[PDB]
Point group: C6
Chain length 181, copies 6
């Protein structure tokens, strides 16, 4: 619940990230921490807007923005992270936490989100899937246009991962959340 394995860029160490999101009694503030670069901070804003746009249909109270504060933290806190690859992870974690819909266990996702809910292709796919296997992720959700980059990946890697090329965020919410979103 509000905890998603995303695959995004890091300055050092694995391109696998745990995204945590908390919704606590507040005034409507948005905090985001974890040594996050601007492009990544912007992806959180984009993902939160997607959620705000769909709130009624997502079973969220559309006026949650006023009586709750949301903190998005990505450990390890001192490791620099950046890029837009965690966007769909950001959205899923927010939907989970605002709803209480637990995220599925062995699932990771990579992909850039747009405000309309399309999933955009990302970079360094090969290194991302490598952090997926070496973190023991069974299912990896990827952007449809990144299918081109699947042919460059070792057979050992792919064989163990269940990779789902996805086009839209509604596919992501279905494949990642435990319950009906």
């Amino acid at each position: 619940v509000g905890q998603v394995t995303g695959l995004a860029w890091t300055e050092v160490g694995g391109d696998l990230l745990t995204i945590e999101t908390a919704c606590v009694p507040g005034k409507g503030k948005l905090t985001y921490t974890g040594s996050l670069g601007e492009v990544m901070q912007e992806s959180i804003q984009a993902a939160l807007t997607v959620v705000r746009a769909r709130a009624e249909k997502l079973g969220i109270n559309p006026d949650f923005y006023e009586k709750r504060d949301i903190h998005v933290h990505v450990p390890e806190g001192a490791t620099p992270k950046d890029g837009p690859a965690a966007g769909i992870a950001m959205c899923t974690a927010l939907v989970s936490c605002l709803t209480g819909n637990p995220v599925r266990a062995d699932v990771a996702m990579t992909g850039e989100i747009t405000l309309r809910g399309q999933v955009l292709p990302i970079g360094g796919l090969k290194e991302k899937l490598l952090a997926a296997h070496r973190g023991g992720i069974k299912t990896v959700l990827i952007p449809f246009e990144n299918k081109r980059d699947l042919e460059e990946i070792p057979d050992n890697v792919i064989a163990d991962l269940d990779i789902h090329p996805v086009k839209r965020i509604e596919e992501v919410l279905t494949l990642a959340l435990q319950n009906e979103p």
Copy 2:
């Protein structure tokens, strides 16, 4: 999962503007969701491009009653303007009319025409100013399969330089003012 709700709250217009790697097609997304009058803008946007967004929103706010929008709309709403792709640096004023069009579309629920792209600097007075790098821009729209391009009236001189087959392919409309831009690009009449 609100895909429909997502559609009616996020405007979407294809713009021709400057990016780190040259003038290019951009999708300008503008969301208007429940809020308190805030404005967010994201997309690795330079400062000139951030100022064009504020200019475009001011055009809508000033003309809200005339576009069938509540003048007190901004009191109960937040607005997020996002320009993909998120890690690509973009700057400049050439997406101004696309930004204006996106806000009008979203706030009036008047969908934007498919095969239309636009380039132009907007002013608070509603006039469209000429932009630079038209060739590159039109070349992008052509390769992307756009049929109709709105350009600023004073960029007519710049069409001589465009390859003939690209000009022949494109339905190019020199516009002087925003009213023309909105009429040509939206599905309904504002």
Copy 3:
């Protein structure tokens, strides 16, 4: 939306500008854009303060700003601008804007404004007036102390132009507002 042709310093192109001012329903915010240097940003503040101090006399309710937002823009948006010389153009635009009393479109103006409504001299009167000339401007308002500078300006530019030297903002508004 107020609209006044100013003559002010720019990094590229002519020293001619359009000052735009909007005043929409809001919360009392001021926004200013136009690739503005800080000196020019401060001149927008000084200009708005002049109008706000003279709200009642100008036919404006002094509590107008309570429930409205103001945006000052200076196209062309990508052109770096700076200096205090668009001060009276900004004051005029705001006055025009808050009153809905249009500005004469055949007028341009240059000058630094003070909180007391005084118009102070500016630099590069020549570059500015050449620009007003190349731009088809018929009438040009300049500061009073700038009269001694018109000697260094081309006789043909002086001949084409209707130059009115001014001391205060009330002269500017009389000459610039159509009503």
Copy 4:
């Protein structure tokens, strides 16, 4: 009302300042413009605090103050100015706009202000007094601890200037303002 001549530091031209203050309707905001360095800005914030702390005595209603905005401007706006030396001038001008008590025109002043209302010595008095001499200023207030430095100033410059060494801000206000700023005027007879 809201116009005091100060003597402080400027990058170019004279060390003389024409300080302007407007008190227009507002929500209690303070603006300070005129290309002012940080020390000078901080000197403006100390001057306003002084006014606020003595509001009842200066007969300023805190309720009136909170429904007003204040703008301190020091033209010419493009000239860099800095230092604490305009503090008593700022405090004078601020009392002025807030009370509509105009400042005597032949009067300039130099000195650092303290929250306690005391007037601290400044530097470059020779420069400052040379400035006011060039402006036909006849009355120049200076901090009492600066009297020592009057000696090294040309007796020609001294003569033409009516110099009042001052110890507190309360003296400053009574000297440079038109009416009596603090308190009720009572008449006694022997």
Copy 5:
């Protein structure tokens, strides 16, 4: 109450840090001072959200932050500090403060906190435990994954210490709080 010895990175290396927290009347603000670097400041934010998400459980009024301000200060004022290692100490200090549950005097602690309450390993454990030894610290709490780092710290130093490898914040608070929460 409102005070915890943490071991965290400072200019002169890992050292004995006194984390202080205050809670006073206000309107929901958060102040942090002590020449703190940004990662260390971000750790304070994560520590607070932990407490805010768990208020009722800790016996804190869920809406405590409504009419109250929080100041977290790390003396000595002039000494630059940074890193995520003081995070379980911030959280403990906040819990102590908001509950009036005194922190034990014999306990120093080091560890990165995540919003979910896990304690992540830190670096420079040697310097930190060598500082707790010189300051008369009996009991030291360290992250569970830091256990193998003990092997690089002089045995005469470790033998003198009551070392507790912890995994979750609930362990940290039980061991560190004078009373039983």
Copy 6:
């Protein structure tokens, strides 16, 4: 009232400081001027929190802040000052102006304050004391652990001064304030 002589570092050196505070009708803003470095700024924020924490005990209306503004100013405005050694001086000036308890003019004071009200040791004690001596200060309050530092100072200087080594801010307030706090 609201004036305290403190001893701290200035660009010329550890010198004599006249610390002013003002409390006027406002909305809860703190302003601090005097060409202060950020360590000095943080000392003010800590000192104010100390006063806010102990508000009711001091006679102060605990809601005082949401209704008033505070300006702390340290002339001379153009002279750069920094560090934490004016902390207890900040705290006293703040207690002074908020309570209307005039400070004794003849007392200087130096020492880093903590959120707990404890007085921490400072540096350049000699320079600080040479100031107070030539400043005509009769009584000087110094941190308790700074007693050792008295021996690197001329005996003629120290013999002229009534030095009070303090441990806590409550000691500071009784010695420096005119009346019962």
